[PDB]
Amino acid sequence: EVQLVESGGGLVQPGGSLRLSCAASGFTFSSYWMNWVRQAPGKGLEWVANIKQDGSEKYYVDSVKGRFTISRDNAKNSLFLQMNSLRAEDTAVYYCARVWWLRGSFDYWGQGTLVTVSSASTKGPSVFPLAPTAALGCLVKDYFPEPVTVSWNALTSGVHTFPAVLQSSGLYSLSSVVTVPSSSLGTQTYICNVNHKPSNTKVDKKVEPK
């Protein structure tokens, strides 16, 4: 199979630098033009840069000119994107994409790598219990970056972990609730498993009715 594997994405303060790499496999890398295209969270696709099959010529979107450098190593089947003077605008999932020819279709993509440019530092969440068939949950608050897994495994009639919100602060917040009979409250003990790996944060919280 054709496979493009991006790597080297992460979090950077405004003004820093990051270098992406794309490991190509399953085709003659040196025969094809190569592209970088990014998609800011919940927004549209924006093409960043492309490079000729032999690095002879490179083209960039105007918003990255002088800041970004595309390059390739056809012997190691590698495509790179060197980013300097990174801005929060550049926050996106950056996709490695092969085009079938100079005016062809983007026929092969990678899974992407997430570049986050934020003045927010890596922060662990604050876990609060959402005290209450009744409903009760856990509130994962102010935490950076993503993701966080929540688990209650204490049987439930049903669980639903809601997608995180990005508050005006630049930090995220997440909620997860379960459904339980309105009398098992004072009897059963309900415990949520909050885990934030980017900040080495694992919290276990009994949710008790106030």
């Binding site: 592209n35 295209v37 919940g42 549209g44 696709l45 924006e46 093409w47 492309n50 010529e57 083209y59 979107v61 996709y95 079938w100 100079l102 005016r103 062809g104 279709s105 983007f106 026929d107 993509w109 990678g110 899974q111 992407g112 604050s126 609060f128 219990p129 959402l130 005290a131 409903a135 949950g137 509130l139 608050k141 639903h160 809601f162 997608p163 995180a164 919100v165 508050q167 005006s168 917040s173 909620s175 609730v177 106030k210």
Partner: protein, 214 residues
């Protein structure tokens, strides 16, 4: 200076037809080939139309690409709609300066379920949060279809105007939609009101829950 513009959203019932336009700006749509990609949540884009009207192998013919030179536009027509067609669709081509121009994208929703009112749960701040000198109101919205809701907060029946954070609705595991809304407050501000209300309006019908400091 070439530029492509798509409708923000489009919708229809299963088995009928939609047309997503890709209007070219400051250029000529017919100068360069036009491609169409179907990207879904959590996935990389895949081609449905390339070179104006060609269909990659396996793509059903319900997808059709055409060029309107008169209005300087291209269109992707999807007939016999299935719910699996629900995705984001992007057109792209090239300008004169060897640049790749992508379209803004179009959200296509296939309405294949009856209307469902949102289930709403409202939670007051916890004692552990107020002990940390904070106060967050958590409003949880679930099981509504289609996924268009608007959220209003109200402190002592007066609409809350600041400190609200609301997620864009997302499809659950049962094809319903779910959303969250947060009202961040101070312990001071929390204890100064007698009632708070999360009002969820869905298709002209409002579901609301009320909490009160104890």
């Amino acid at each position: 200076n070439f530029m492509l513009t798509q409708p923000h959203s489009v919708s229809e019932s299963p088995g009928k037809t939609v047309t997503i336009s890709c209007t070219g700006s400051s250029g000529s749509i017919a100068s360069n080939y036009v491609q169409w990609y179907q990207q879904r949540p959590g996935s990389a884009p895949t081609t449905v139309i390339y070179e104006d009207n060609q269909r990659p192998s396996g793509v059903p013919d319900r997808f059709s690409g055409s060029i309107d030179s008169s209005s300087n536009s291209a269109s992707l027509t999807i007939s016999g709609l299935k719910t699996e067609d629900e995705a984001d669709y992007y057109c792209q081509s090239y300008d004169s300066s060897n640049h790749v121009v992508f379209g803004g994208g179009t959200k296509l929703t296939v309405l294949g379920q009856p209307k469902a009112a949102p289930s709403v749960t409202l939670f007051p701040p916890s004692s552990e949060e107020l002990q940390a000198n904070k106060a967050t109101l958590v409003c949880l919205i679930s099981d509504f279809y289609p996924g268009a809701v608007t959220v209003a907060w109200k402190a002592d029946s007066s609409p809350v105007k600041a400190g609200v954070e609301t997620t864009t609705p997302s499809k659950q595991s049962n094809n319903k939609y779910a959303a969250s809304s947060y009202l961040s407050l101070t312990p001071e501000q929390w204890k100064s009101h007698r009632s708070y209300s999360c009002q969820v309006t869905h298709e002209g019908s409002t579901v609301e829950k009320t909490v009160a400091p104890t």
